Amino acid sequence: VVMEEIIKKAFIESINNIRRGDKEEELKKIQEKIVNAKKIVVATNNQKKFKVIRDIMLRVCNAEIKMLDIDTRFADLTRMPALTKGLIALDIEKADLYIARGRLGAPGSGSMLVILDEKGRVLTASLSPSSVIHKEDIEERIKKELIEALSRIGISIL
Amino acid sequence: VVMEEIIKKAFIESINNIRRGDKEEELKKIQEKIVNAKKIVVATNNQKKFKVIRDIMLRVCNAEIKMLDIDTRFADLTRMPALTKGLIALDIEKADLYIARGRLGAPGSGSMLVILDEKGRVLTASLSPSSVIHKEDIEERIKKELIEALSRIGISIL
Amino acid sequence: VVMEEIIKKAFIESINNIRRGDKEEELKKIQEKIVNAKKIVVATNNQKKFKVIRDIMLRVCNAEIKMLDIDTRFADLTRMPALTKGLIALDIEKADLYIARGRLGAPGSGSMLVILDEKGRVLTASLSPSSVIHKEDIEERIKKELIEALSRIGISIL
Amino acid sequence: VVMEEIIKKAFIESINNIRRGDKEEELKKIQEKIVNAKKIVVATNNQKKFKVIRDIMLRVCNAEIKMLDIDTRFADLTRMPALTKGLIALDIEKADLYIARGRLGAPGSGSMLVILDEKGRVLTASLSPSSVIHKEDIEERIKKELIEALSRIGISI
Numbered sequence: 001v002v003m004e005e006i007i008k009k010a011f012i013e014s015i016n017n018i019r020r021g022d023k024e025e026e027l028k029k030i031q032e033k034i035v036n037a038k039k040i041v042v043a044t045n046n047q048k049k050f051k052v053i054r055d056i057m058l059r060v061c062n063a064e065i066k067m068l069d070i071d072t073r074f075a076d077l078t079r080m081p082a083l084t085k086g087l088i089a090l091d092i093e094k095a096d097l098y099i100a101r102g103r104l105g106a107p108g109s110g111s112m113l114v115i116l117d118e119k120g121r122v123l124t125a126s127l128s129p130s131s132v133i134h135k136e137d138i139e140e141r142i143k144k145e146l147i148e149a150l151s152r153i154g155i156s157i158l
Numbered sequence: 159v160v161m162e163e164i165i166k167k168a169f170i171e172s173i174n175n176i177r178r179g180d181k182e183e184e185l186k187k188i189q190e191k192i193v194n195a196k197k198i199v200v201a202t203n204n205q206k207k208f209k210v211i212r213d214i215m216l217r218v219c220n221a222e223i224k225m226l227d228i229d230t231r232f233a234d235l236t237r238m239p240a241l242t243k244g245l246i247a248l249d250i251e252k253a254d255l256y257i258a259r260g261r262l263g264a265p266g267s268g269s270m271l272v273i274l275d276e277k278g279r280v281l282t283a284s285l286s287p288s289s290v291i292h293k294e295d296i297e298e299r300i301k302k303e304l305i306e307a308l309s310r311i312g313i314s315i316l
Numbered sequence: 317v318v319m320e321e322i323i324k325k326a327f328i329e330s331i332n333n334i335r336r337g338d339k340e341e342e343l344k345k346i347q348e349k350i351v352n353a354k355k356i357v358v359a360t361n362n363q364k365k366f367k368v369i370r371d372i373m374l375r376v377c378n379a380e381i382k383m384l385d386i387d388t389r390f391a392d393l394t395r396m397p398a399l400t401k402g403l404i405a406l407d408i409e410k411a412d413l414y415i416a417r418g419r420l421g422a423p424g425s426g427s428m429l430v431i432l433d434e435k436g437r438v439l440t441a442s443l444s445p446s447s448v449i450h451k452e453d454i455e456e457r458i459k460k461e462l463i464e465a466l467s468r469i470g471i472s473i474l
Numbered sequence: 475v476v477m478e479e480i481i482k483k484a485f486i487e488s489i490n491n492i493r494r495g496d497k498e499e500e501l502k503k504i505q506e507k508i509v510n511a512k513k514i515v516v517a518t519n520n521q522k523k524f525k526v527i528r529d530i531m532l533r534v535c536n537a538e539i540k541m542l543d544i545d546t547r548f549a550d551l552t553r554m555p556a557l558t559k560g561l562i563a564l565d566i567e568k569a570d571l572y573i574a575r576g577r578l579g580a581p582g583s584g585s586m587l588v589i590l591d592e593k594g595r596v597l598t599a600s601l602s603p604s605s606v607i608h609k610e611d612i613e614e615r616i617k618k619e620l621i622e623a624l625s626r627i628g629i630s631i
């Protein structure tokens with residue numbers, strides 16, 4: 001069953017007041033989309049971030065993985081910058097999966113890393129506390145963020 | 159300074175490539191908006207979810223706290239249901255803060271609790287894994303979500 | 317060239333501040349997307365709305381055109397109901413093009429017809445005044461809306 | 475009523491499947507928000523665009539009307555740049571209304587002018603064809619878009 005047919009079913013359940021939350025078939029399709037991704041685009045031009053992401057993703061799938069040629073810092077003027085960055089990458093590059101990391105919402109709100117599919121659907125995300133608070137190396141932070149975004153949909157890096 | 163003037167500064171930084179993450183003034187402003195709120199709307203008609211949220215928020219601020227008299231489950235046909243739920247409350251109720259909890263993304267993607275201000279800005283949020291995995295009492299889940307959403311922007315419940 | 321490449325050039329212009337509005341290549345690519353579409357989904361379960369749009373779209377392309385099995389009225393709790401209806405159709409059906417027609421914005425704001433591409437991108441659109449004013453048959457309104465949305469990107473129905 | 479209550483009424487009609495389009499009260503309320511605005515922000519730092527919009531809006535209301543100090547062209551990397559410009563101005567300026575004009579959607583998709591209220595709700599909008607086609611002066615174009623955006627919610631200059 002294709003993702004669209006799985007989502008159709010969820011939407012019908014919601015409309016008709018029988019939706020009881022996420023279902024096993026749905027989680028499985030999510031996992032499948034990530035693990036089976038053949039091409040992955042990371043919505044950054046910052047080589048530091050890219051390498052942390054790429055190395056982890058290589059433990060889970062057999063995709064070609066690349067970053068962007070433009071600076072996505074301008075997403076930082078939007079309401080939800082991490083998400084904006086993911087849709088910028090979706091507009092300019094064809095891929096199976098898009099991974100973005102940046103600010104969650106307003107200045108002050110900490111960070112969000114998000115994984116989108118090829119139509120811009122939010123498959124998974126994870127957040128860190130504002131760097132003003134945690135003060136960890138950005139490298140260690142992104143690593144923890146990616147790993148938690150995967151574990152929360154049943155994907156272990158082993 | 160006013161929130162709008164704080165955000166203008168952040169935006170100027172990003173436009174001109176000198177933005178080095180969240181700043182103290184920015185964190186402080188968010189905490190202030192939450193701690194000083196006079197009216198809070200919880201973006202549900204579900205009594206159980208409301209009570210859990212309210213009892214916590216009364217530990218941190220002195221607001222009148224109320225829930226909605228419409229079912230926001232129809233948000234579940236949109237891309238980011240939890241955010242959609244916040245913006246429905248924003249459209250139909252006047253408050254200083256809006257709290258919503260729902261599915262993060264596509265079916266299977268787990269949960270998001272989000273706090274929005276007076277103009278729909280994302281102030282903070284937290285996520286839980288797909289209920290398919292964690293399998294916890296929802297009321298215990300929402301407690302953990304709200305406390306982490308507060309703690310990641312410097313607000314302690316104790 | 318591929319749409320992604322075209323958009324990348326535009327974004328590059330914008331970043332550098334040499335963007336002087338839409339380009340012939342961009343118009344040509346939009347036209348191509350529409351005229352060459354093989355499958356079109358109308359984001360509605362309303363047979364009247366469907367028939368109007370179908371018969372017009374058949375004058376411009378050789379697609380299979382269908383509607384949905386679910387009522388996309390629930391998009392009418394969101395900020396931008398017409399756009400929300402398009403993104404619901406995108407989530408539940410595969411197609412080259414999605415056409416949605418509903419309320420522009422807040423209650424009282426009149427109507428929007430919008431055409432999206434297979435990744436959710438906005439190709440063209442058109443509006444009618446609020447029905448409280450114009451008082452015309454819905455089918456006559458949708459016909460005029462569609463024909464406008466097509467002529468403003470250089471597509472003639474004649 | 476307050477706008478929030480008029481909106482709840484409308485949403486309730488929708489949930490129950492009895493919504494039969496816009497209503498006179500909702501249209502009145504939109505007109506009211508526009509004509510009675512005391513402050514308006516034009517979401518641009520472009521003087522020519524600002525001036526065309528200001529001179530028209532001064533015929534409809536008695537507001538203070540101002541533009542931004544930042545270039546909102548960075549909106550042009552998002553899916554719907556005109557709307558994004560609106561919500562940038564909302565984030566950095568208090569006002570009763572916000573007016574933005576820029577590209578509707580994808581490169582090549584033509585223009586949109588939009589008017590948002592103080593919570594970012596979409597009150598009205600208007601579109602022009604791709605400039606590649608109409609080939610008009612941008613100032614004539616914006617005059618026509620604002621006028622149509624006002625006239626479609628019952629506001630005559």
Ligand SMILES: Cc1c(O)nc(CC(=O)O)c(C)c1OP(=O)(O)OC[C@H]1O[C@@H](n2cnc3c(=O)[nH]c(N)nc32)[C@H](O)[C@@H]1O
Binds near residue numbers: 270294
């Ligand atoms: C509608 C919906 C959905 O499809 N998926 C999720 C993700 C997930 O299941 O983790 C959520 C949170 C959701 O939204 P909502 O907060 O409205 O949850 C709807 C229903 O889905 C089940 N559910 C949601 N979150 C939890 C949870 O944390 N624990 C348990 N036991 N059930 C849950 C409950 O029956 C609940 O009434």
Ligand SMILES: Cc1c(O)nc(CC(=O)O)c(C)c1OP(=O)(O)OC[C@H]1O[C@@H](n2cnc3c(=O)[nH]c(N)nc32)[C@H](O)[C@@H]1O
Binds near residue numbers: 101102107130142
């Ligand atoms: C632009 C931006 C922002 O204003 N705030 C935040 C939230 C926060 O500061 O916690 C983020 C994540 C952000 O986006 P981006 O991922 O582009 O990070 C921007 C810059 O802000 C700093 N920064 C962001 N996240 C971290 C972190 O986890 N650790 C450290 N040390 N610095 C960080 C770095 O200078 C980094 O290059």
Ligand SMILES: Cc1c(O)nc(CC(=O)O)c(C)c1OP(=O)(O)OC[C@H]1O[C@@H](n2cnc3c(=O)[nH]c(N)nc32)[C@H](O)[C@@H]1O
Binds near residue numbers: 335575604611
């Ligand atoms: C950045 C941008 C774009 O890529 N496409 C469009 C649609 C279109 O070209 O029809 C617009 C409106 C736009 O946004 P903005 O209002 O910021 O226009 C950017 C530049 O694009 C040109 N332009 C935009 N609207 C018009 C117009 O109505 N007439 C003419 N001659 N040029 C125009 C001008 O050079 C202008 O400085």
Ligand SMILES: Cc1c(O)nc(CC(=O)O)c(C)c1OP(=O)(O)OC[C@H]1O[C@@H](n2cnc3c(=O)[nH]c(N)nc32)[C@H](O)[C@@H]1O
Binds near residue numbers: 454457
């Ligand atoms: C839900 C909704 C709404 O509240 N307002 C508007 C703006 C407006 O009233 O002008 C629209 C377009 C709408 O969405 P939708 O296309 O789903 O219409 C819902 C119903 O609202 C009435 N309606 C909408 N557009 C027209 C129109 O162009 N002509 C007429 N006569 N009725 C209309 C019809 O009863 C229709 O069944």
